[PDB]
Amino acid sequence: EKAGHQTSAESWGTGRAVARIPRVGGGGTGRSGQGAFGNMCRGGRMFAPTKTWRKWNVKVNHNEKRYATASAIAATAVASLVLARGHRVEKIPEIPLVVSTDLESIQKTKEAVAALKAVGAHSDLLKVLKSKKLRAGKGKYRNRRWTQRRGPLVVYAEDNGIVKALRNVPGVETANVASLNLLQLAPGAHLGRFVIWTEAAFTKLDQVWGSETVASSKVGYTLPSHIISTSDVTRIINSSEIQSAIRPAGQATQKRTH
Amino acid sequence: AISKNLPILKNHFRKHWQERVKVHFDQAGKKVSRRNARATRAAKIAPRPLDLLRPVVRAPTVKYNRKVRAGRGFTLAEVKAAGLTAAYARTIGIAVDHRRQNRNQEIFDANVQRLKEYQSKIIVFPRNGKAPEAEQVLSAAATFPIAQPATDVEARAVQDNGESAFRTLRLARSEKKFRGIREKRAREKAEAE
Amino acid sequence: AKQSLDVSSDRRKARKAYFTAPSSQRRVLLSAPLSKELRAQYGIKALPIRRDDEVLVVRGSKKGQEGKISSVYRLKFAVQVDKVTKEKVNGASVPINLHPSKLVITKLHLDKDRKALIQRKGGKL
RNA sequence: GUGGCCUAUCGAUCCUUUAGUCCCUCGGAAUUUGAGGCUAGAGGUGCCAGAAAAGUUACCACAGGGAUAACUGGCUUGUGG
RNA sequence: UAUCUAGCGAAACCACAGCCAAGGGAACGGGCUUGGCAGAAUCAGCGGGGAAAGAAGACCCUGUUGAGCUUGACUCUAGUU
RNA sequence: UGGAGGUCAGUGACGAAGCCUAGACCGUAAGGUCGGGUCGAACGGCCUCUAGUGCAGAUCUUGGUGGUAGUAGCAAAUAUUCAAAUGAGAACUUUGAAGACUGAAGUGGGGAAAGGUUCCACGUCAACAGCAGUUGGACGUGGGUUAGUCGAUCCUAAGAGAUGGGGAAGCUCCGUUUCAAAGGCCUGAUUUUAUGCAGGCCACCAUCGAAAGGGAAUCCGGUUAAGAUUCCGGAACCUGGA
RNA sequence: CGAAUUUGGGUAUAGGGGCGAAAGACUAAUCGAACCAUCUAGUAGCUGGUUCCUGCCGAAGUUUCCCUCAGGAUAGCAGAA
RNA sequence: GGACCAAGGAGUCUAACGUCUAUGCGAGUGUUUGGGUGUAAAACCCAUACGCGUAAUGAAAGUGAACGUAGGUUGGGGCCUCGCAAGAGGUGCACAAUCGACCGAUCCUGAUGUCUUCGGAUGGAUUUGAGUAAGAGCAUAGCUGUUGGGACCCGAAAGAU
RNA sequence: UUGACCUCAAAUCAGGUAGGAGUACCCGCUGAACUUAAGCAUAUCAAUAAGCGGAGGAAAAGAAACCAACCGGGAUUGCCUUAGUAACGGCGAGUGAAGCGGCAAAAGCUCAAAUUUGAAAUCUGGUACCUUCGGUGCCCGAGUUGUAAUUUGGAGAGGGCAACUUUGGGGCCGUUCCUUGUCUAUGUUCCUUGGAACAGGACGUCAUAGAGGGUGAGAAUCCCGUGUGGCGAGGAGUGCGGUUCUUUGUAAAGUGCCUUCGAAGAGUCGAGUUGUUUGGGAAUGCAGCUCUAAGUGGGUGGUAAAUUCCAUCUAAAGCUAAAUAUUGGCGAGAGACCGAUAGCGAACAAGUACAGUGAUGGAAAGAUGAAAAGAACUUUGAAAAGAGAGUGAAAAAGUACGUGAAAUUGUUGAAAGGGAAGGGCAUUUGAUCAGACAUGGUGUUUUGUAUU
């Protein structure tokens, strides 16, 4: 708050053939007689100095947060969204990828890597490993020296060495079904995170988020309803129930007359 | 200045408010420090429930008259009816409040019952024993919760006798308003023969 | 990744600690790895380098150059090895520094303290 | 016939003061006084949509103004010639 | 002294620049219009012009900008009674 | 444009970023892409986030640089000249010779304030001496200041200022002998016993304040590159001590 | 130009104060109220500046009130949704 | 104003808000003061409260929103019934105009009763309200606009300590 | 002729203590104006800045002379809220709390006023002894104008019954924080580029370690570390389990019945007035002056004045952790921050150099290279230096050093030029330069003979 103001500068006024900016008084320095206090001035205070009471955190409604989390989880099961997000799942039989609780009980990093290789997430591992690069700016000397891709998110229900076994494996993240962060479920606000569920995590999803026959255990919460019954608007448009009332069409393009 | 159709706002920022700005950046760190302090005090008093047993009291005003909440400490009358001295209650973890009186039998019974429950549910170690610890719990408040007394049943019988409960309110307000004038009239009529 | 809160992964702090380390810490910083033969003999992966250790270069323009250490210039963060020099144009031979991390220790200068440190780190002579 | 034959002859907030219900409040119930409210007038701002207000500076200062005076120049030519 | 030479060597100023006549134009042009014209590089003088330079006119007005001084201005005050 | 989250398993020491280029293409443009030189360690496309985000001006700020311009100028204080030496080099250094000047309220010989080593010796062009420089109060390295008698120190002047006291919320203010219980030199004591004691006089009424006021006392000759009323030789004086 | 003389050193007087044989003079090149730091990035209806491109739309200097006349509110004119 | 060139250089952030828009939920809404937990400022999870909204009006004591298919009339998109292309009928949400009804305030007339001075039924009135009349809000974010803040950047003469 | 008391002195008497610093936060005093009101005087700014006094790790406040008006809460302090509200305000500009409610933290209390009077039972100091933050002999002193025990308003005070917990004290192994120390994994294997491999490729290894840094370029595996555990060079020791010498064998605490009571703070409450202050309004707090109390008294109950009744506390004496604050100090971890005209004034011998008599003012200034390998030697010059040579990956890195941009210059080259230059349209001239002619189709006299 005192940067640029540790000076006793006063304006010289008019009549001295110099600008009316405040000037440092005294002599025999070279700093004396120099402009001060202003944003245009060298050593002066910046314009509108940054303050700490700027709004840093942003409030989001609990329901909107849970809506986004549910959308991200549902995007994890869309095969095309995961490809678009770029997760090297072209050699996985099907997604959502559900594995046994032996993975929950896994202990060593080498055997966690073996599990990933046997299941099909090793290509994502190699992508993370080979994408490591130096940052492209002044972020290197701000403790952000390297950047790499995001690997699979291993979601478990119980922690029996799963976290520590995957802790050193690069790019892999591990999460509990109870938390299931949106910052890990849609990094960069991009849907379709590659997720490896344990069987217990997959089973507990229905308790955590509710169903048509089960409540969410998030009190007062139920999953959002789509605004449209199906996304297959092409199928609806081309259904017989509509085409029957539809009047006959043109040529998909008009012949140039005159 | 003043301008188009807008509310008149009173933003009290004509002093040097920028010196007195307290933005709570330490919310997370202070929550961590509070949890750490609670854990450290629990380790210090390792067998003890981390807090004192508070009584049930009524909230004072007419707006919170309905609610029943946790007070500061039990009355000397309450701890006497439970069967303890004030000093021993304080020493074995019962909050004692000297200045609070009980003009209310219902609250008296509720707090005496709370005291009996606490006495039954705690164990006092001897001063020269083997200290048979019992997996300390951390909240006397959580294990002796304050429950709102049930005032009435869900269903009852309609007992109508024809006063409408609005004429009653109007009349009671009228008697309150005019009692002094009525007493005036009575005293004047007694005085003037 | 780090887990403890007294470990700092800040580049500025780590660099300052390195460059302003005293000589006692520079001794540990200037540790050198033993050869394969010496590692098999002792059971020690690396040791803080000393003045009379016989050392072999395994990296740089003097790869495969043998020589006994002539000094451990902790101020310059380097070691000076005999017969690893540069002949200036005037004919004077000047020492050429090199980091002990680019060396391999091929013969240890053993005294009571070196042997005790070997047993401490897990060696058996 | 709801003042003057018509077209002028006049006055906010705040405060005071009067008139009216003797109507509401003084917040722990009130004899009662006092005070505060409700509605209509009056006490006044003539700079009349309403600040509470003496000069001097040739010792002077600042922000400005060619929105504005003291030269020239420009239009005019009453006046002068 | 200026002047020429050896050495040494600044500054004020500078939109771009540098020939006129008239016209019109912010009513006195180096530029624009129409004419006159118009030949490298320059030296010493000079004081007509550059409405030359020096200074956000000190005169004048405006500002709900001051300050020094005065008083039967408004509002107070130290002392004193 | 700087940063941030994702992604291109993007570009790169076989050359990133920057910079130069009357070379090319694209876009109406903001601008983007590439060719060729320079180089040396990081950088970019895309979807989003974010802001200390874009300059021709503000008599803008800070640096740098021009034309003016090899121009104004380097003209007060009478004035310099010949030879030799040294030197790479001499109008300016040194030494001779001449001509002069200050002309004893000096351009002489000392000091006060101030400066602080400029004093003195030894080495040459980088800077400085508004020309030059072999010279210098410059640069580098060294040496140099000797007191009983000269000063300070002591005294008091105008004055400043503690204490005792009294103000003031207080920092502090007044006051300087005031409404105060305000201290110091000789023999007896000076050894079975100390500075304890009828041993005496008593009553300056802090202190600071002058290198020109007052005041105890040193002169001559010689000596150094540079100190001398200080060193040496000779000859004296003052103060304090049985 | 022998004194109301000139001057060294010491000392006193400090800012709404001092000091003045009196000029608003002098008080460290500062005086019709010194200098230093801070309040203070004081306020300014006033002057100056206000940084990329293209596309579409596109004014007002008028009304009423204002210590109002270099300013504002209001209505109008304009854009966007 | 600008001799020149480089770099720097001027509508910012915050508190409280207006219109609009997007989103979530919706007669409700807002987790984040706190508590639990955590892969140690992130997640993630947890309300009795509190804010705003769901009732107005009056200075206040206080009183407090269906005479009806939540009314009548005009106009209304859409939908329904329609003959071979007119155009007729019906129902008509939103919204606009109008006449009413209800709640509060003001001015009135005052019934059975009676702490004979109280309660105020009933009927009204060119009066009046930011009201009712099958809720629309709460929260977050964004542009723009507002006010207080250095407040787009530079600029006094002054004033204080 | 003597011995005391009271008060007041003296001593280089014995032993202590205070001052000053720092001051971010804390407790007070004192105290403005700029500013806003579009002027301005009350107001605002602001009970702020400057000035002064005084502490600590926090300070302060704190166990009601409280809030309330309720079915009543119950020390203090903070947060959310109350609430931009009630109120204050030329009722203008503006200002503006508190109760309740949720939560964080929670903790309680002790003096005066009582005769121990069958025993001043209390305490500093001097001198001895010892287990020395002290404990015991003795002596003097203080003290009755009152030092101990006893009671503090919640209460508490010359006694007696019917079963009735405890004790308490200096040590030792150890629960517990650090100066902290030490030990604990895995390639430097082959090829390419390079001066250097830390870069590309192949093969691997460890991983509860792929954080970060160093090393001649982007290094988990070369080094330090990092992750997980293990073992230790010391200090602080009722939030305690067992030992340790043992209970100073009349040691201090409650009701089913009260023989009496029940001391409770004075120039102080309170009233007036004055000034200041508060949202506090016929006056919120504070202070000066005047008057000046009382015991079912006194205060309050947010509009000034007898009361049939209330309600609620108990002042004028005192201590007390935690939640709370913290632009200072010490230690540590971070950042969508800045990146050498930026960020602190200061990345550097920076509060330095220099400017002022002084108070004060206060810069500029980072980068050779991996390594000085900082250029031996030869030649010209008086010398600086040049030209060769040399080191280097590079000297287009030579200390005036990473690339070195623009303004501004020198040289060469090319062009125009009769009192500006520059610009637009259009062409011409000279320079310079990009755009199918290997091809989704036909086919052939072999260029050097999956076809050319």
Short mmCIF file of C-alpha atoms (C1' of nucleotides) in Angstrom, two decimals, chain C residues 1-15 18-19 28-33 36 39 44-47 58-63 76-77 86-91 94-103 117 120-122, chain I residues 181-190 194-198 208-216 219 221-228 230 332-335 337-339 347-348 369-377 389-393:
data_model
loop_
_atom_site.label_atom_id
_atom_site.label_comp_id
_atom_site.label_asym_id
_atom_site.label_seq_id
_atom_site.Cartn_x
_atom_site.Cartn_y
_atom_site.Cartn_z
CA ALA C 1 5.53 -36.30 -4.19
CA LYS C 2 6.25 -34.77 -0.80
CA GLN C 3 3.92 -35.27 2.16
CA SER C 4 5.50 -33.58 5.19
CA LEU C 5 4.94 -29.88 5.82
CA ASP C 6 8.55 -29.03 6.73
CA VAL C 7 9.72 -30.02 3.24
CA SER C 8 9.51 -27.13 0.77
CA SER C 9 9.22 -27.71 -2.97
CA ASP C 10 9.85 -24.04 -3.79
CA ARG C 11 12.48 -23.49 -6.47
CA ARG C 12 13.61 -20.14 -5.05
CA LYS C 13 14.10 -21.52 -1.53
CA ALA C 14 15.87 -24.68 -2.71
CA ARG C 15 18.21 -22.74 -4.99
CA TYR C 18 22.03 -24.75 -2.27
CA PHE C 19 23.96 -21.61 -3.19
CA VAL C 28 27.23 -33.81 1.65
CA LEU C 29 26.14 -31.97 -1.51
CA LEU C 30 29.42 -32.97 -3.19
CA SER C 31 28.82 -36.70 -2.71
CA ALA C 32 30.08 -39.03 -5.44
CA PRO C 33 28.97 -42.55 -6.40
CA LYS C 36 30.42 -50.98 -9.56
CA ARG C 39 29.68 -50.77 -4.57
CA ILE C 44 27.49 -48.31 -0.42
CA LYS C 45 25.81 -46.52 -3.32
CA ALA C 46 27.57 -43.18 -2.80
CA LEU C 47 29.73 -41.31 -0.31
CA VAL C 58 32.20 -41.13 -16.29
CA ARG C 59 30.70 -38.04 -17.96
CA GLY C 60 32.07 -35.08 -19.90
CA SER C 61 34.98 -34.41 -22.23
CA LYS C 62 37.28 -36.42 -19.91
CA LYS C 63 35.29 -39.65 -19.81
CA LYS C 76 33.34 -23.64 -6.25
CA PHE C 77 31.18 -26.78 -5.81
CA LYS C 86 44.34 -27.91 -19.05
CA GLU C 87 47.60 -26.72 -20.61
CA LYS C 88 47.29 -22.99 -21.22
CA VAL C 89 48.93 -21.45 -24.27
CA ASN C 90 51.71 -20.02 -22.07
CA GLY C 91 52.53 -23.56 -20.93
CA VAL C 94 45.73 -25.23 -14.60
CA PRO C 95 43.30 -27.51 -12.74
CA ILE C 96 39.97 -28.25 -14.38
CA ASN C 97 37.01 -28.54 -12.03
CA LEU C 98 34.26 -31.10 -12.36
CA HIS C 99 31.28 -32.12 -10.29
CA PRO C 100 31.61 -35.33 -8.23
CA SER C 101 28.17 -36.40 -9.49
CA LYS C 102 29.90 -36.91 -12.86
CA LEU C 103 32.58 -39.10 -11.25
CA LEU C 117 30.65 -43.96 8.25
CA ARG C 120 26.87 -46.56 9.59
CA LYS C 121 25.54 -46.44 6.02
CA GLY C 122 25.53 -50.24 6.05
"C1'" G I 181 21.44 -36.27 14.78
"C1'" U I 182 21.80 -40.55 11.91
"C1'" C I 183 20.40 -44.98 8.63
"C1'" U I 184 17.04 -46.84 4.92
"C1'" A I 185 15.24 -47.90 -3.47
"C1'" U I 186 16.07 -47.92 -8.54
"C1'" G I 187 20.88 -47.29 -15.46
"C1'" U I 188 24.70 -43.33 -15.46
"C1'" U I 189 23.72 -50.10 -20.29
"C1'" C I 190 24.10 -49.51 -26.15
"C1'" G I 194 26.31 -32.14 -29.43
"C1'" G I 195 31.79 -28.83 -26.69
"C1'" A I 196 28.84 -30.97 -22.81
"C1'" A I 197 23.22 -35.84 -23.09
"C1'" C I 198 20.53 -33.88 -18.62
"C1'" U I 208 4.09 -45.59 0.35
"C1'" A I 209 10.06 -42.37 -3.56
"C1'" G I 210 7.59 -39.56 -11.10
"C1'" A I 211 8.03 -32.92 -4.83
"C1'" G I 212 12.03 -29.67 -5.51
"C1'" G I 213 17.08 -28.51 -6.42
"C1'" G I 214 22.30 -29.47 -8.39
"C1'" U I 215 25.12 -31.49 -12.19
"C1'" G I 216 28.73 -28.67 -18.97
"C1'" A I 219 17.55 -36.15 -15.37
"C1'" U I 221 16.48 -44.19 -11.73
"C1'" C I 222 24.29 -39.35 -11.45
"C1'" C I 223 24.13 -36.36 -6.54
"C1'" C I 224 21.32 -34.03 -2.59
"C1'" G I 225 16.97 -35.02 -1.35
"C1'" U I 226 11.64 -37.04 -1.69
"C1'" G I 227 8.17 -41.52 0.33
"C1'" U I 228 8.06 -45.23 4.47
"C1'" G I 230 14.20 -47.62 12.29
"C1'" A I 332 8.03 -22.16 8.41
"C1'" G I 333 4.81 -23.23 3.99
"C1'" A I 334 2.61 -21.10 -0.27
"C1'" G I 335 0.72 -17.89 -4.80
"C1'" C I 337 1.37 -11.71 -8.08
"C1'" C I 338 6.12 -8.67 -10.24
"C1'" G I 339 10.03 -9.94 -13.21
"C1'" A I 347 17.79 -8.63 -6.59
"C1'" C I 348 24.36 -5.41 -6.32
"C1'" G I 369 31.91 -18.55 -21.03
"C1'" A I 370 30.45 -25.30 -19.18
"C1'" A I 371 35.23 -24.08 -17.77
"C1'" A I 372 39.40 -18.01 -17.84
"C1'" A I 373 40.68 -22.01 -21.15
"C1'" G I 374 40.86 -13.76 -19.53
"C1'" A I 375 44.42 -14.27 -25.68
"C1'" A I 376 51.59 -17.65 -24.96
"C1'" C I 377 54.28 -16.02 -29.07
"C1'" A I 389 48.72 -16.11 -34.06
"C1'" G I 390 46.12 -18.65 -29.84
"C1'" U I 391 41.74 -20.63 -26.27
"C1'" G I 392 36.97 -21.55 -27.11
"C1'" A I 393 31.04 -24.79 -29.59
#
